[PDB]
């Protein structure tokens, strides 16, 4: 999403949001290759979404 709501979150709550984003990306590219998904942009945004989580996970867990 945005940065700051994720910046208030815990480490393991960031981990379950990471897993939720991975499941979301999985279902999205399955729908994309299957012939569903008229709205492609979700793919890109979920990609950047995971990057956001991972960036905070490299700040919060140790750096």
């Amino acid at each position: 999403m945005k940065a700051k709501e994720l910046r208030e979150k815990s480490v393991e709550e960031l981990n379950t949001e990471l897993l939720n984003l991975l499941r979301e990306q999985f279902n999205l590219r399955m729908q994309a290759a299957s012939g569903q998904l008229q709205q492609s942009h979700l793919l890109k945004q979920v990609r950047r979404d995971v990057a956001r989580v991972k960036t905070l996970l490299n700040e919060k867990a140790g750096a």
């Binding site: 991975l22 499941r23 290759a33």
Partner: protein
Amino acid sequence: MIREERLLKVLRAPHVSEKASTAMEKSNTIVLKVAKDATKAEIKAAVQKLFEVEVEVVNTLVVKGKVKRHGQRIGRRSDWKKAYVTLKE
């Protein structure tokens, strides 16, 4: 852990063609475009994790990319991996 991250990263698409559909109808086998590395253990764990179906054996192969001509340029496509996953009966 980091296992389910890998399992979600392995699978890419189901393959669709005439041989894929015929193997699905007769031989109870789904054809999947998988990751380039994507071993048989990771594929079997990923299908049993993300489709909740039980999986008997996995036969994989690496499909080579064809050199396509665009205007005057030549481009070799991506080398990808295909997995025939045989489910239970």
